[PDB]
Design an enzyme around this catalytic site. Structure first.
Site, mmCIF file in Angstrom:
data_model
loop_
_atom_site.group_PDB
_atom_site.id
_atom_site.type_symbol
_atom_site.label_atom_id
_atom_site.label_comp_id
_atom_site.label_asym_id
_atom_site.label_seq_id
_atom_site.Cartn_x
_atom_site.Cartn_y
_atom_site.Cartn_z
ATOM 1 N N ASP A 99 -6.265 -14.406 8.945
ATOM 2 C CA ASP A 99 -5.052 -14.220 8.130
ATOM 3 C C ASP A 99 -3.960 -15.224 8.488
ATOM 4 O O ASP A 99 -2.795 -14.884 8.578
ATOM 5 C CB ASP A 99 -4.528 -12.795 8.201
ATOM 6 N N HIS A 141 0.874 -1.162 0.000
ATOM 7 C CA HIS A 141 0.000 0.000 0.000
ATOM 8 C C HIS A 141 0.923 1.227 0.000
ATOM 9 O O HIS A 141 2.015 1.211 0.584
ATOM 10 C CB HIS A 141 -0.819 0.149 1.287
ATOM 11 N N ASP A 164 2.450 1.958 3.372
ATOM 12 C CA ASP A 164 3.449 1.032 3.904
ATOM 13 C C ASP A 164 4.843 1.459 3.490
ATOM 14 O O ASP A 164 5.811 1.218 4.206
ATOM 15 C CB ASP A 164 3.277 -0.366 3.276
ATOM 16 N N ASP A 181 -11.395 -12.144 10.679
ATOM 17 C CA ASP A 181 -10.401 -12.497 9.670
ATOM 18 C C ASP A 181 -9.082 -12.858 10.354
ATOM 19 O O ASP A 181 -8.415 -11.983 10.926
ATOM 20 C CB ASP A 181 -10.220 -11.270 8.783
ATOM 21 N N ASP A 231 -1.475 -12.879 1.602
ATOM 22 C CA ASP A 231 -1.948 -11.787 2.450
ATOM 23 C C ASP A 231 -2.251 -12.451 3.790
ATOM 24 O O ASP A 231 -3.342 -12.953 4.013
ATOM 25 C CB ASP A 231 -3.183 -11.128 1.873
ATOM 26 N N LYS A 247 -14.702 -8.441 0.485
ATOM 27 C CA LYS A 247 -14.700 -8.952 1.854
ATOM 28 C C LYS A 247 -16.071 -8.712 2.446
ATOM 29 O O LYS A 247 -16.644 -7.666 2.160
ATOM 30 C CB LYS A 247 -13.667 -8.205 2.707
ATOM 31 N N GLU A 298 -11.025 -6.386 -4.534
ATOM 32 C CA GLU A 298 -10.853 -7.403 -3.502
ATOM 33 C C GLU A 298 -12.085 -7.390 -2.609
ATOM 34 O O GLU A 298 -12.221 -6.461 -1.780
ATOM 35 C CB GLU A 298 -9.614 -7.097 -2.682
ATOM 36 N N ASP A 335 -5.233 -13.741 -3.577
ATOM 37 C CA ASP A 335 -4.655 -13.645 -2.252
ATOM 38 C C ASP A 335 -4.881 -14.928 -1.459
ATOM 39 O O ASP A 335 -6.010 -15.372 -1.267
ATOM 40 C CB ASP A 335 -5.258 -12.460 -1.462
ATOM 41 N N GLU A 354 -9.759 -13.396 -1.938
ATOM 42 C CA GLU A 354 -8.921 -13.836 -0.843
ATOM 43 C C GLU A 354 -9.562 -15.016 -0.144
ATOM 44 O O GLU A 354 -10.743 -14.990 0.210
ATOM 45 C CB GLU A 354 -8.694 -12.716 0.141
ATOM 46 N N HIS A 399 -11.536 -14.394 3.086
ATOM 47 C CA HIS A 399 -12.690 -13.490 2.949
ATOM 48 C C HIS A 399 -13.928 -14.267 2.539
ATOM 49 O O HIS A 399 -14.999 -14.064 3.109
ATOM 50 C CB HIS A 399 -12.376 -12.400 1.946
ATOM 51 N N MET A 447 2.103 -5.852 -8.028
ATOM 52 C CA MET A 447 0.819 -5.350 -7.591
ATOM 53 C C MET A 447 1.060 -4.275 -6.571
ATOM 54 O O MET A 447 1.998 -4.350 -5.766
ATOM 55 C CB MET A 447 -0.036 -6.475 -7.035
#
Lengths: 386, 386, 386, 386
Positions: free
Chosen positions: A256, A53, A56, A254, A286, A182, A180, A244, A216, A219, A87
């Site tokens: 992860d 992102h 980040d 979530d 992810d 969710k 994406e 993802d 994902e 998700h 990406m």
């Protein structure tokens, strides 16, 4: 021994291995990682590239000169390691200004800001070589029914994506968008909550060819849906631009988890599908190393994502190559599923007495499908008992 | 006192009040109802019409002469009561021949039979005046991953729907199709599991204009999704051709409770949306009187479906008409959500320093959304404390 | 090759392989099986024994002479095969009289009948050698809030179980009871919905030592709970009298898949726990061969239940015996979890400055738990990559 | 107009209205509140008291002198407003040292520290007048199967609670403990995940009379369980020492909505039960004003918690007082549910031919339960249509 190489196209977000461990109930358990160090460590593990992102890589609020310095150092790390950036995406969820959304915030001034913040990062993504630009609308949604008129919010979401498509076209950029989905978290309900809703939305955009999905694992599993089935629909529509990978234990927050954790059989069927369909995009993780772990555990978790993919790939390939499985697929009529129902056409079907008037329904009903034998062959292959 | 009239467009399936009470663990608790008696009783309660699967009206296996007799008696009941038949559908799920599906069965001969059985009932639906033909693919799916190649199954599903569209067009019929999604049950996972997946699929058919959705409250709630949000997306796409109303308590087996039971606040927001959007189709109840009930309880349950809709309609209308609510909607910027983000266009947005360079992010972030006050006004109106 | 023998203590209900395939939306797809044939076929597959509800062995309504004939034929099959009957149970759910429950029906006359029907079958279970008598209160519960006062229903449930304990004690029978929890289905909510609720209830009975639990994999997973954790609590309390094994994909209707299907990692951790704790009771399968299958598929499914248990047993044993796993368990401080926190006592703890005043919280917080490495060793062992 | 007074016993945690809005994906949206200001504002709204974790009142790491200053200022606010402190609890979840738990951390030194931190706060709770000391073991659990041997963890949990009981007894304190279950979040699975599991655990403690439960609406709903049913079981066992009220929309992350939001019908049945059973403890709100809100929205949300309780109390009282409801309860045989099944005793039951040999099962099965009429009366009362 299941060693990844850059040719396997494994990629990781900076925010994955860089997650400090803050959760709704707890403080950080790890220090922040410099993106340069993450690139170097991931390259050593055999990753192909990284994703980011905006926020980040460039701290929110940076001046143009600090921004340039952060990008320069990152590009040097890419050059030193051979890592790619396939990406990129925008953070439209952390800062308090986005508390009611970015593209669908009720405040118009916030919506305009969200578009400008996104456009600035599209330019940077192209500079770094990204082919896919992801949009995760994590704050687009509501906790209460009156807060958001969903029809108006979808108009605003379409307007935003249409403007972004106009931008990339006018600049001549070769980069495509992936939405994406969710279902919830952090909002009580998130707009475009599943692969299906995202696919349907794309068909109403001005230039649908520029947009696909980035589903994902966890998700879709937060809605109790079958992730391989959803990926199959995305592939059938020509819209699987990115994926993802992670793990999730059911319908809950979530988690992860690392890929392979969670629903292991679904992970097997996913890898079988991706490899059989010839998906050629990045295999992106992810995930979040759990906050119980120190840095050695972070890298063990990341390595485990890739290891589990490569084990499952071997097992799925062995399943499909086994002559006994090929015979069982014919016994279950997977070959007949692939043949047209009525290539003879409507009129021929209507005139075919064997399709209705003289069809022996009881004989057809008595034929077993032989699915349990097939599924036990799949289990035996997954477990290495074949 | 919340008395329905035929003008409210309330409709019921024959199989709803006619459910005998058999469940996975138990025998029937009620005798079968003659469809003629159901039409008469529903008309007395103020319903507008009824709907049917083929096999609810004509027992499976009937000869052409028994079929004609069953239809004649039913038409007399319609004539005697003024009841309409706005929707019909096919049973492609009860008979053992459909154990692996109808349109997506692995066996090709079953797929052809499923189409012929459907076409025969389209003719009858048109004869009885139906405007919408529903398809619920309850057996299309799988319990195991290898049993169904989803890409091939979607090809077969598209082929089937395309053939049905060719049929109606060639015959000159004014009837449209609506796909009814469900995520699971009776299959482990059902294809086209949500409103979103169904909307996306329709866009790949040869004549998409002939196809819409028939969403059901409890089905979307079996995936933990927000039913009003899904209906809003269907309305935004122009595809809400019919709707099925019932109640569901969460993510579990399909309960088919009477409308208003289950998630009562979601029922309020649904009625608010349907009435605000001017939905003009039938308000159809697909519910099951619980097997605890005798026939008096069946009719009490059916009456309660209509009563709860009419109470919620009153409360939602009072909410929207209240000047204090109108002020609270402006305080929460629902008016600004309805305005374009950038009618000035892309270039103007890029050149607007107030959208980025000079945007005061901290001042924007500090503005409260006032959503909790708005939601408490909604609660007070629902409960009649305003 | 993972061949079961009667020494593995695998047992099956008559109603499992005998399920005809009727579901809420469909008719039977298989003919009924004679219990004698099921005993013979199961014995050939290597099962140790069978279990039954009253009504599976003796059709409801049988006269005393037909009852005797059915029992005699069944006993001959047991004698001819060496199969045992370790568990029996009552059907208090199929017949319409039980539509509001057995032990907690609102009608008192139904409650008395339910007790008499149960007592008659306790006598028969003892005659056939059963050691455990299961109670699954599948109709005890409600769809609506006013229908059942739960405090009064728990009084009635305690009364029923206390009376059954008085009966077995007065007759001198060596048979114990096990309560089988389930959260929902067929009732909207079932009383005693989880292992925990059942364990708590037992402590209020007059003779708690006579009662334990019979948890089922898929039941706890229908509430999204961790089945191995629940079994651990039952073992810790001394109350795991029996266990039911199957598979379930998440929070949805009860699927009753074969054991190993569903959540495969949870199946691994379950077998690890049962074998490590030395559980010596039957490994009972309460599953349904899917209605897609013919009889060959029924027996393949049953065989797969046993095969998957035996594969998982091997893998879990190899995990625990691996010196690298033993080292990783020490690295994660599983050894320290097993040591008392304060065997020195309260006063010593209060006076120990190293436990508070001089405890270095930052040094303790920085220690990683090394759980991801441990979990990847577990994954590698499960998959046979070690 | 539904105005609370201190006599309604409404209480709030400092951390509820004081939540700054940080979530897994976002920064704080509100400034921190001084506890003194929260006490003053809550008193103005009509609350009766407040509750606290240690670390909400005294910042972690405070010296003894700063601790004394924080307590003194807080006590002055209590004295100035008349607010009480009926409950206190320990934060054993935020600081990184607790990343693997407090009482069940694998590291023994952390377990000892967790006990010492708890004991210090028990002393303070007693000083401030608290009657109930809550334990929420939010970090007790695991993300992976090998990380935690649950039997050893339950031994450590029992050891901890037994030591705390020894402490309070030796000091002569009149304060009781209440265990707050939660199924997951922040750990993948939390030990003692439901009311049932907590009730069962308490029965194995050395002094069970000192321990009860503190159930929370949204926690049980995160497992899809019926919260009123669970509260009924806690009341039946004599163990409902405290209750936490909020709202939750289904099986997802813990939303902590204001009470009345989420499942509104479950909120009605909860209030009906608490008021009918004469529960006399605090009505405590453990909720989070959504991060969309400014401080005016915080206080509106808090006020709405109390308002919704008082509206539901009125409606439930009117339901129970309505003669037509009293008649419908008799029609549904709620009176017969409250009568003993067999006060005549076992032998009389065995000899009663009307309970089996001469019981007319078909006549009993044909009686309707009349539950749908009863439930529609309940709906009409909830909505103020009666």
């Amino acid at each position: 021994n299941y060693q990844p190489t850059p040719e396997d196209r494994f990629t990781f977000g900076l925010w994955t291995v860089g997650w400090q461990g803050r959760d709704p109930f707890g403080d950080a358990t790890r220090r922040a990682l410099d993106p340069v160090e993450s690139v170097r460590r991931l390259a050593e593990l055999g990753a192909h590239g990284v994703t980011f992102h905006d926020d980040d890589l460039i701290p929110f609020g940076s001046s143009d000169s600090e921004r340039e310095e952060h990008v320069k150092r990152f590009r040097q790390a890419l050059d030193d390691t051979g890592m790619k950036v396939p990406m990129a995406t925008t953070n439209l969820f952390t800062h308090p200004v986005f508390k009611d959304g970015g593209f669908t915030a009720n405040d118009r001034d916030v919506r305009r800001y969200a578009l400008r913040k996104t456009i600035r990062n599209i330019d940077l993504a192209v500079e770094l070589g990204a082919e896919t630009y992801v949009a995760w609308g994590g704050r687009e949604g509501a906790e209460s029914g009156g807060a958001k008129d969903v029809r108006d919010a979808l108009d605003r979401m379409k307007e935003a994506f249409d403007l972004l498509g106009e931008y990339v076209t006018s600049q001549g950029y070769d980069i495509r968008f992936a939405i994406e989905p969710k279902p919830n978290e952090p909002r009580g309900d998130i707009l475009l909550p599943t692969v299906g809703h995202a696919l349907a939305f794309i068909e109403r955009l001005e230039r649908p060819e520029l947009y696909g999905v980035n589903p994902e694992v966890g998700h879709e599993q937060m809605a109790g849906l079958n992730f391989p089935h959803g990926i199959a629909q995305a592939l059938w529509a020509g819209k699987l631009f990115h994926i993802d990978l992670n793990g999730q234990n059911g319908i809950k927050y979530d988690q992860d988890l690392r890929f392979g954790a969670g629903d292991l059989r679904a992970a097997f069927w996913l890898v079988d599908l991706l490899e059989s369909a010839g998906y050629s995009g990045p295999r992106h993780f992810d995930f979040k190393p759990p906050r119980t772990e120190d840095f050695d555990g972070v890298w063990a978790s990341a390595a485990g994502c890739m290891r589990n993919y490569l084990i499952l790939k071997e097992r799925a390939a062995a399943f499909r190559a086994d002559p006994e499985v090929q015979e069982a697929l014919r016994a279950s009529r997977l070959d007949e599923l692939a043949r047209p129902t009525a290539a003879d056409g409507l009129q021929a079907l209507l005139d075919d007495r064997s399709a209705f008037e003289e069809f022996d329904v009881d004989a057809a009903a008595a034929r077993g499908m032989a699915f349990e034998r097939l599924d036990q062959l799949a289990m035996d292959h997954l477990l290495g008992a074949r």
